[PDB]
């Protein structure tokens, strides 16, 4: 891919974060805390899962960013509608306004309904996420493996403004405490 030149500076939106998340001062890193992080509840916060949005909203153009997933056991990454449900239980699917991939239990899957098995030869330490709003495309790249394609969602029905989407995952095992980090351009 030659997509790096649509590079955007993503920051995390503290107001949207699950109340157990800890976002760094520079708003570029997020991890699961071992407890509630002493913030007020609000209608934006994801209640059921360790999720947070980027502050940026996109309704046109091409956008690219990279995320560090080093030493994590579980995570979700991609984009979502600004209007996605925040409270209660829901599945990550394009019908619910999410275009995502994830890791759990040593398998990588795309968030279709039902989910799609991914074939990755080199487990990624950094993921590139490319959005072409006009084309209706969300693509994922393996930065650890020379930028090799992971998955492409096409004919996407964005149906509104998009936000970068993150899930640091639970840490039941004690092996998933590491942060997600937005990587420098
Ligand atoms: C804990 C878990 C894992 C899982 N997978 C998806 C298929 C590939 C393997 C991982 N699915 C579920 C569904 O409740 N739970």
CSV table of C-alpha atoms and ligand atoms in Angstrom, one decimal:
chain,number,residue,atom,x,y,z
A,1,UNK,CA,0.0,0.0,0.0
A,2,UNK,CA,1.1,3.6,-0.7
A,3,UNK,CA,-1.5,5.2,1.7
A,4,UNK,CA,0.8,6.7,4.4
A,5,UNK,CA,0.5,10.2,2.6
A,6,UNK,CA,-3.2,10.5,3.8
A,7,UNK,CA,-1.8,10.3,7.4
A,8,UNK,CA,-4.0,12.0,10.0
A,9,UNK,CA,-3.1,12.9,13.7
A,10,UNK,CA,-5.6,10.9,15.8
A,11,UNK,CA,-6.3,11.7,19.5
A,12,UNK,CA,-8.6,9.9,21.9
A,13,UNK,CA,-11.8,11.5,23.2
A,14,UNK,CA,-11.8,11.0,27.1
A,15,UNK,CA,-15.6,11.8,27.2
A,16,UNK,CA,-16.4,8.7,25.1
A,17,UNK,CA,-14.2,6.3,27.2
A,18,UNK,CA,-15.4,3.5,29.3
A,19,UNK,CA,-14.9,4.7,32.9
A,20,UNK,CA,-12.2,2.0,33.6
A,21,UNK,CA,-9.9,3.4,30.9
A,22,UNK,CA,-6.8,5.5,31.4
A,23,UNK,CA,-5.8,7.9,28.6
A,24,UNK,CA,-2.4,9.4,28.5
A,25,UNK,CA,-1.7,13.2,28.8
A,26,UNK,CA,-1.0,13.4,25.0
A,27,UNK,CA,-4.3,11.5,24.3
A,28,UNK,CA,-2.3,9.0,22.1
A,29,UNK,CA,-2.3,6.0,24.5
A,30,UNK,CA,-5.1,4.1,26.3
A,31,UNK,CA,-5.1,1.1,28.7
A,32,UNK,CA,-7.5,-0.8,31.0
A,33,UNK,CA,-7.3,0.3,34.7
A,34,UNK,CA,-7.6,-2.2,37.5
A,35,UNK,CA,-10.7,-0.2,38.8
A,36,UNK,CA,-13.2,2.7,38.0
A,37,UNK,CA,-11.2,5.8,37.1
A,38,UNK,CA,-13.2,8.3,39.3
A,39,UNK,CA,-15.0,10.1,36.4
A,40,UNK,CA,-18.7,11.1,36.1
A,41,UNK,CA,-21.0,9.0,33.9
A,42,UNK,CA,-22.3,10.6,30.6
A,43,UNK,CA,-24.4,9.5,27.7
A,44,UNK,CA,-21.2,9.2,25.4
A,45,UNK,CA,-19.4,6.6,27.5
A,46,UNK,CA,-19.3,3.0,26.3
A,47,UNK,CA,-20.8,1.2,29.4
A,48,UNK,CA,-20.3,-2.6,28.8
A,49,UNK,CA,-16.9,-2.8,27.1
A,50,UNK,CA,-13.4,-1.2,27.3
A,51,UNK,CA,-14.0,1.1,24.3
A,52,UNK,CA,-13.2,4.7,23.3
A,53,UNK,CA,-13.5,6.8,20.2
A,54,UNK,CA,-11.0,9.2,18.5
A,55,UNK,CA,-11.9,12.9,18.8
A,56,UNK,CA,-11.7,13.3,15.0
A,57,UNK,CA,-14.9,13.1,12.8
A,58,UNK,CA,-14.6,12.3,9.1
A,59,UNK,CA,-17.4,12.7,6.4
A,60,UNK,CA,-15.2,12.9,3.2
A,61,UNK,CA,-11.7,12.1,1.9
A,62,UNK,CA,-9.1,9.5,2.6
A,63,UNK,CA,-7.6,9.0,6.1
A,64,UNK,CA,-4.9,6.8,7.4
A,65,UNK,CA,-3.5,6.1,11.0
A,66,UNK,CA,-1.4,3.3,12.7
A,67,UNK,CA,-2.0,1.6,16.1
A,68,UNK,CA,0.6,-0.3,18.2
A,69,UNK,CA,-0.9,-3.6,19.6
A,70,UNK,CA,2.4,-5.1,21.0
A,71,UNK,CA,2.0,-7.8,23.7
A,72,UNK,CA,-1.8,-7.6,23.7
A,73,UNK,CA,-4.0,-10.8,23.9
A,74,UNK,CA,-7.2,-9.1,22.8
A,75,UNK,CA,-8.4,-5.9,21.1
A,76,UNK,CA,-10.7,-4.4,18.5
A,77,UNK,CA,-9.7,-1.7,16.0
A,78,UNK,CA,-11.3,0.2,13.2
A,79,UNK,CA,-13.9,2.9,12.6
A,80,UNK,CA,-17.6,3.4,13.5
A,81,UNK,CA,-20.5,5.8,13.0
A,82,UNK,CA,-20.7,8.7,15.3
A,83,UNK,CA,-24.3,7.5,16.1
A,84,UNK,CA,-23.3,3.9,17.4
A,85,UNK,CA,-25.1,2.6,20.5
A,86,UNK,CA,-23.0,3.3,23.7
A,87,UNK,CA,-25.0,1.5,26.4
A,88,UNK,CA,-25.7,-2.2,27.0
A,89,UNK,CA,-24.8,-5.2,24.9
A,90,UNK,CA,-24.2,-5.1,21.1
A,91,UNK,CA,-22.2,-6.9,18.4
A,92,UNK,CA,-19.6,-5.2,16.2
A,93,UNK,CA,-21.0,-5.4,12.7
A,94,UNK,CA,-21.5,-3.1,9.7
A,95,UNK,CA,-25.3,-3.3,10.4
A,96,UNK,CA,-24.6,-1.8,13.9
A,97,UNK,CA,-22.3,0.9,12.4
A,98,UNK,CA,-18.8,-0.7,13.0
A,99,UNK,CA,-16.0,-1.6,10.5
A,100,UNK,CA,-13.5,-3.5,12.7
A,101,UNK,CA,-11.0,-6.4,13.0
A,102,UNK,CA,-10.1,-8.0,16.3
A,103,UNK,CA,-7.8,-10.5,18.1
A,104,UNK,CA,-9.1,-12.9,20.8
A,105,UNK,CA,-7.8,-16.4,21.8
A,106,UNK,CA,-5.0,-16.5,19.3
A,107,UNK,CA,-7.3,-15.9,16.3
A,108,UNK,CA,-7.7,-12.7,14.1
A,109,UNK,CA,-11.3,-12.1,12.7
A,110,UNK,CA,-13.1,-9.3,10.8
A,111,UNK,CA,-16.2,-7.9,12.4
A,112,UNK,CA,-18.7,-9.0,9.8
A,113,UNK,CA,-22.0,-10.8,10.8
A,114,UNK,CA,-21.2,-13.5,11.3
A,115,UNK,CA,-17.4,-12.9,11.8
A,116,UNK,CA,-14.8,-13.8,9.1
A,117,UNK,CA,-11.6,-15.7,9.8
A,118,UNK,CA,-8.4,-13.7,8.9
A,119,UNK,CA,-5.2,-15.3,7.5
A,120,UNK,CA,-2.1,-13.5,8.9
A,121,UNK,CA,1.3,-15.3,8.6
A,122,UNK,CA,3.2,-12.6,10.8
A,123,UNK,CA,1.3,-11.7,14.0
A,124,UNK,CA,1.2,-7.8,13.8
A,125,UNK,CA,2.7,-5.5,16.4
A,126,UNK,CA,1.3,-2.4,14.4
A,127,UNK,CA,-1.9,-2.1,12.3
A,128,UNK,CA,-2.6,0.5,9.6
A,129,UNK,CA,-6.2,1.6,9.2
A,130,UNK,CA,-7.2,3.3,5.9
A,131,UNK,CA,-10.6,4.8,5.2
A,132,UNK,CA,-11.8,6.1,1.7
A,133,UNK,CA,-15.1,7.8,2.5
A,134,UNK,CA,-16.1,8.4,-1.1
A,135,UNK,CA,-15.2,4.9,-2.2
A,136,UNK,CA,-16.9,3.2,0.8
A,137,UNK,CA,-13.7,1.3,1.8
A,138,UNK,CA,-12.1,0.4,5.1
A,139,UNK,CA,-8.8,-1.5,4.8
A,140,UNK,CA,-6.4,-2.9,7.4
A,141,UNK,CA,-2.6,-3.3,6.8
A,142,UNK,CA,0.1,-5.4,8.7
A,143,UNK,CA,2.9,-2.8,9.3
A,144,UNK,CA,5.1,-5.6,10.9
A,145,UNK,CA,4.9,-7.5,7.5
A,146,UNK,CA,5.9,-4.7,5.0
A,147,UNK,CA,2.3,-3.3,5.0
A,148,UNK,CA,0.6,-6.5,3.7
A,149,UNK,CA,-3.2,-6.4,3.4
A,150,UNK,CA,-5.2,-7.9,6.3
A,151,UNK,CA,-8.8,-7.2,5.3
A,152,UNK,CA,-10.9,-4.8,3.1
A,153,UNK,CA,-14.6,-3.9,3.8
A,154,UNK,CA,-16.1,-2.5,0.5
A,155,UNK,CA,-19.5,-1.1,-0.4
A,156,UNK,CA,-19.6,0.3,3.2
A,157,UNK,CA,-22.8,2.2,4.2
A,158,UNK,CA,-21.2,4.7,6.5
A,159,UNK,CA,-24.6,6.6,6.8
A,160,UNK,CA,-23.0,9.5,8.7
A,161,UNK,CA,-19.8,10.9,10.1
A,162,UNK,CA,-17.1,8.3,11.1
A,163,UNK,CA,-14.9,8.2,14.3
A,164,UNK,CA,-11.7,6.1,14.9
A,165,UNK,CA,-12.8,3.2,17.2
A,166,UNK,CA,-10.7,1.3,19.8
A,167,UNK,CA,-11.3,-1.6,22.3
A,168,UNK,CA,-8.3,-2.4,24.7
A,169,UNK,CA,-10.1,-5.6,25.7
A,170,UNK,CA,-10.7,-7.0,29.2
A,171,UNK,CA,-7.8,-8.2,31.3
A,172,UNK,CA,-9.3,-11.3,33.1
A,173,UNK,CA,-6.0,-13.3,32.4
A,174,UNK,CA,-3.5,-10.7,33.7
A,175,UNK,CA,-1.8,-10.9,30.2
A,176,UNK,CA,-3.7,-8.1,28.4
A,177,UNK,CA,-2.8,-5.0,30.5
A,178,UNK,CA,-0.6,-3.4,27.7
A,179,UNK,CA,-1.9,-0.1,26.1
A,180,UNK,CA,-3.1,0.6,22.5
A,181,UNK,CA,-0.8,3.4,21.2
A,182,UNK,CA,-1.3,5.7,18.2
A,183,UNK,CA,2.0,5.6,16.3
A,184,UNK,CA,3.9,8.7,15.0
A,185,UNK,CA,3.6,9.6,11.3
B,1,LIG,C1,-14.6,-16.3,24.0
B,1,LIG,C2,-15.2,-16.4,22.7
B,1,LIG,C3,-14.3,-16.6,21.6
B,1,LIG,C4,-14.9,-16.6,20.3
B,1,LIG,N1,-14.2,-16.8,19.1
B,1,LIG,C5,-14.8,-16.5,17.8
B,1,LIG,C6,-14.5,-17.6,16.9
B,1,LIG,C7,-13.1,-17.9,16.7
B,1,LIG,C8,-12.5,-18.1,18.1
B,1,LIG,C9,-12.8,-17.1,19.1
B,1,LIG,N2,-16.3,-16.5,20.2
B,1,LIG,C10,-17.0,-16.3,21.3
B,1,LIG,C11,-18.5,-16.1,21.1
B,1,LIG,O1,-19.1,-15.9,22.4
B,1,LIG,N3,-16.5,-16.3,22.5
